Design a protein around this nucleic acid. Structure first.
Lengths: 156, 59, 141, 168, 298, 36
RNA sequence: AGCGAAUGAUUAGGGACUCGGGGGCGCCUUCAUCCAUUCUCUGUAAGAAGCCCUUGUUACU
RNA sequence: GUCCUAAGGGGGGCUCAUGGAGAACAGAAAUCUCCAGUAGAACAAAAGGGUAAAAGUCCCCUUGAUUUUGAUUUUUGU
RNA sequence: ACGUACGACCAUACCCAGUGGAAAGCACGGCAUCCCGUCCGCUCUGCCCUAGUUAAGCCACUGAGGGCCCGGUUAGUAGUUGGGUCGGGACCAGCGAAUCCCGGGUGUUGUACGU
């Protein structure tokens, strides 16, 4: 389906509005399922951002940004961006595959919450979290704040 | 300002279509009890020398 | 100025504090560029930095003059030949006055404007004057 | 004119197989080029998309390889056996290069593997004289002289003298 | 049928610089090489210019002025025949020896030769000259920056052999060990033994040994003057060591080039004898009149 | 529009801090030299 | 700041046409759909607070 | 309501748009080779200024797209 | 004077054709073990300076060459600043061009080492 939309809609003889509509539809389909597309077709469609039509340009940039958050490995090193290249170099970004489900063995930010608790204990001395202690709601809020701070630091 | 569309035909019509339109319109003004709908948007502009020769031959 | 490579003797000119510099903005280099104003203006160097110099300009606003300090890269500054006619002259007066004081004869040491020319005699031989009408005769032909 | 440094030499021979489609066909064409030359062939992508050619941009549709030295002479002479040492006059370019094209690679001496199939080739021979390093070097790169540039007639004469070919 | 090269093209054409049209100068790198901080004023910025020809190595100490560059000191590879090296004048060891000779010459010209004596016995280790323990106090080493020109600065190039020779001669050139011919990019460790082998020219020695074992015809074709002067593979280390000793002993030896020798005046006379001249305007007008007569006849 | 008056000694306020600090140290040294 | 072969038209003759629409008896059609075609490039300086020599101070060079 | 409001730094290599001549299928257009090519390409101003061993393009490492204190310009604070 | 290296002005230096090059120097050249880089030792890098050749690069000269540059003229003209109780543009006092044409030219020069 994506190949047919690309062939009929985005081409040399196609009109600018037809190309923009096809690229928008392709972007929506890739939003719902990213694995439908091949890397060569994705790079070809992302290279349509250099087109002189504003609608086609914005549709191609939308597809590029969508694959930037989702799966930047197909995207070219020129088009990945800052955060995508940093994540791929440091090793956080993992390939997305068919059927994979989130499998967090621990809570998100639980390590940060344990680090904050250890810092508080060290401060008290100067003056495992999921295994032993029950989750206080204030502790959960502090863990969420620490996770947000860690996400902001990773973005920065 | 200069524009390319000042030098183009703005209204064109074919021979058979013009003839059919004229015939149907004449049949319409044949009946005085029939009135047109949206006549301001209809092409109604399409619907609506012996002395000289003698003087030319003999001044 | 021709497009392409910039001449490299621009970097080999040494500027010191107190030097008089023109501001001729190079279009190729965008770093260190001053405003649209202060281009083609002459000023005094007060600060010398690694790739730029500070120029004292006197801008006019309303009915007064305001001192402005403008940081301009070496690309856009050029040495000004306003005071070369002063430095060469003051040196020339220095040695000429030393020599004249050693010799004894006083001299006129101030520059003088154009005086009327003196009397002289012009010979007619081999330079006989030609008589001219209000219009040329070969033109009236 | 008769200087030892004015002899025409084969600068390079470039072998091209433009399949027009990606995948197994291009892989087997690259296998043919690798087996013939002895070097790793290089793939060529489509630089722009054409709808009725059945290609798209950034899709590998061709493969080619460059051979220099006696290997280029050997492969060129095998291709000239395939063409029976007969080239038409339009096959020679104005700068003195030439080239031709065969429809099947079995005639070069390669065996017919039923997995690989049938592929044709484009041979292009680029000719130089000694002293092309003047225009190919980095420091003090200059232009070749007009008396040292090769003429189409000189290339045709060299072909008919070396390979006993019939230019017609 | 269109003409790209027409009169409007020739009128709008703006040429490059002359030394860039000749393909000899990289002005983009030259600006960074010769630009001195204006806070430092008239402090000279010395650059060790290294160039390679087919049969020679040209090493110079260069400073920059408004109307041209100045050669403070200069050492050439062909001057190593005075110190003993008369074979392989463009190899890595000859590059090292030329850099050492240039460093000794510039230190002797400055007068800091005895204060700054570098590594007297080359070992192959990444070292930089530091401040000397002068009786007055601490004297900083003389600083120069390497100028390779349009050379590709890959691992094992002789542009770094000249730099190593100058650095062992005593000149402080800022440098790193990753482009020496013993460095492994994966390991990020310099091989001292291989660097010393390149310094003493052992790669050429093992080249001759390998060809003497394998291909005698190619060995005689390539190393023919080595056989004619009866210099062997094992003697290269002693030859280059003795050359280093003589360079550090007397850096101003004079070498007779065996070329025809004359003076400046009769060389000028010879060059004007072998020099055709431009036609006088009377002669060119006569030839233009002859061309006009030919056109009238035609 | 008369030309404004200019001070005999401009301030070191405009100059770079490194040369300003060096100049202040030099002024202190020449002050002690004059006092001696 | 706006315009732009990134434009404005042409489509008679050729096709694809078919459910695009509609008509008549699954079959033909009558329009119509488009496509194939083509045309249009004003600043500063003219000194004693200035010049030259000697000599120090510095963590700057 | 979705979508776009732009990846910066350092080093190295190479020239772009286009035209001519050539190569089985291949032709106007698929890939390859040479010559000419002052930018007629590209750089997020569609006919502004500026760039050719680069400010363009590719490759390798990187996030100076980091804190702190004053000065200048556009002109109290920004 | 002629080469080479680094250069300053950056076409009087560029582009296209021919002709010649003492001496040395450049250059093409020869070989891929090592350092290094490629689809290809083409480029880059390493080794040789022995052989061959000035064929090309380079240098010099030639061209009623294109271009570029410099002079005369154009012209005390055009233009421009003040004056008149000057007319219905011309004088007075002054400043003052560039095209078009007529021609010339086709690089100077610093440092260092050599021939």
């Amino acid at each position: 389906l994506v190949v047919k939309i690309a062939n009929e809609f985005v081409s040399e003889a196609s009109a600018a509005e037809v190309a923009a509509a096809g690229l928008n539809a392709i972007r929506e389909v890739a939003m719902r399922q990213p694995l439908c597309m091949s890397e060569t077709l994705l790079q070809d469609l992302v290279l349509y951002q250099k087109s002189k039509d504003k609608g086609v340009m914005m549709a191609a940039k939308g597809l590029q940004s969508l694959y930037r958050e989702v799966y930047p490995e197909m995207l070219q090193k020129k088009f990945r961006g800052k955060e995508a290249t940093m994540g791929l170099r440091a090793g956080e970004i993992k390939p997305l595959k068919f059927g994979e489900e989130e499998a967090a063995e621990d809570i998100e930010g639980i390590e940060l919450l344990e680090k904050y608790k250890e810092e508080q204990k060290k401060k008290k001395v100067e003056q495992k979290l999921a295994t032993t202690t029950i989750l206080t709601p204030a502790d959960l809020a502090k863990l969420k704040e620490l996770r947000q701070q860690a996400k902001l630091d990773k973005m920065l | 300002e200069p524009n390319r569309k000042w030098f183009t035909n703005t209204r064109v019509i074919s021979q058979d279509t013009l003839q059919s339109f004229r015939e149907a319109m004449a049949e319409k003004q044949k009946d005085p009890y029939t009135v047109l709908l949206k006549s301001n948007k209809l092409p109604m502009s399409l619907i609506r020398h012996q002395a000289k020769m003698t003087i030319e031959r003999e001044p | 100025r021709k497009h392409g490579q910039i001449p490299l003797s621009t970097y080999l000119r040494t500027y010191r504090v107190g030097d008089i510099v023109d501001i001729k903005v190079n279009g190729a280099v965008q770093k260190g560029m001053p405003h649209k104003f202060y281009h083609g203006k002459t000023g005094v160097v007060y600060n010398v930095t690694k790739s730029a110099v500070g120029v004292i300009v006197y801008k006019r606003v309303k009915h007064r003059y305001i001192e402005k300090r403008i940081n301009v890269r070496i690309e856009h500054v050029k040495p000004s030949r306003s005071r070369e006619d002063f430095l060469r002259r003051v040196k020339e007066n220095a040695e000429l006055k030393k020599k004249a004081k050693a010799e004894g004869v006083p001299v006129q040491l101030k520059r003088q404007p154009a005086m009327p020319r003196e009397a002289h005699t012009v010979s007619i031989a081999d330079n006989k004057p030609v008589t001219l009408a209000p219009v040329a005769y070969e033109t009236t032909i | 004119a008769q200087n030892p440094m004015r002899e025409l030499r084969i600068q390079k021979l470039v072998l091209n197989i433009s399949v027009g489609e990606s995948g197994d066909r291009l892989t087997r064409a690259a296998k043919v080029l690798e087996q013939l030359s002895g070097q790793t062939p290089v793939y060529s992508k489509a630089r722009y998309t054409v709808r009725q050619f059945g290609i798209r941009r950034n899709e590998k549709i061709a493969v080619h390889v460059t051979v220099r030295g006696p290997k280029a002479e050997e492969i060129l002479e095998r291709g000239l056996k395939v063409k029976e040492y007969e080239l038409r006059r339009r096959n020679f370019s104005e700068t003195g290069n030439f080239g031709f094209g065969i429809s099947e690679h079995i005639d070069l001496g390669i065996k017919y593997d039923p997995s690989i199939g049938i592929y044709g080739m484009d041979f292009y021979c680029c000719m130089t004289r000694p002293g092309e390093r003047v225009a190919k070097r980095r420091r003090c790169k200059s232009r070749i002289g007009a008396s040292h540039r090769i003429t189409r007639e000189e290339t045709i004469r060299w072909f008919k003298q070396r390979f006993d070919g019939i230019v017609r | 049928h269109k003409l790209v090269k027409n009169s409007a093209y020739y009128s709008r054409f703006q040429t490059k610089f002359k030394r860039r049209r000749q393909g000899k100068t990289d002005y983009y790198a030259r600006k960074r090489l010769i630009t001195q901080a204006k806070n430092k004023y008239n402090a000279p910025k010395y650059r060790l210019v290294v160039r390679f020809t087919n049969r020679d190595i040209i090493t110079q100490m260069v400073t920059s002025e408004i109307n041209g560059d100045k050669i403070f000191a200069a050492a050439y590879s062909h001057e190593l025949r005075a110190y003993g090296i008369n074979h392989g004048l463009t190899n890595w060891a000859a590059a090292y020896a030329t850099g050492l000779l240039l460093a000794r010459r510039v230190l002797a010209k400055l007068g800091l030769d005895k204060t700054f004596t570098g590594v007297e016995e080359p070992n192959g280790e990444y070292t930089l000259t530091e401040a000397a323990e002068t009786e007055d106090g601490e004297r900083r080493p003389f600083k120069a920056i390497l100028d390779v020109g349009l050379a590709r600065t890959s691992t094992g190039a002789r542009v770094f052999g000249v730099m190593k020779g100058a650095s062992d001669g005593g000149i402080f050139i800022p440098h790193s060990e990753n482009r020496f011919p013993g460095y492994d990019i994966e390991t990020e460790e310099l091989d001292t033994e291989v660097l010393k082998k390149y310094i003493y020219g052992g790669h050429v020695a093992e080249y001759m040994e390998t060809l003497a074992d394998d291909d005698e015809e190619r060995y005689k074709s390539q190393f023919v003057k080595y056989i004619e002067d009866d210099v062997e593979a094992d003697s290269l280390e002693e030859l280059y060591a003795e050359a280093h000793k003589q360079i550090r002993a007397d850096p101003f030896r004079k070498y007779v080039s065996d070329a025809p020798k004359k003076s400046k005046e009769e060389w000028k006379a010879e060059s004007l004898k072998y020099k055709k001249a431009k036609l006088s305007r009377e002669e060119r007008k006569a030839r233009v009149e002859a061309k006009i007569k030919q056109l009238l006849a035609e | 529009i008369k030309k404004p008056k200019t001070q005999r000694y401009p301030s070191l306020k405009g100059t770079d801090p490194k040369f300003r600090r060096n100049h202040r140290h030099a002024l202190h040294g020449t002050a002690k030299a004059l006092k001696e």
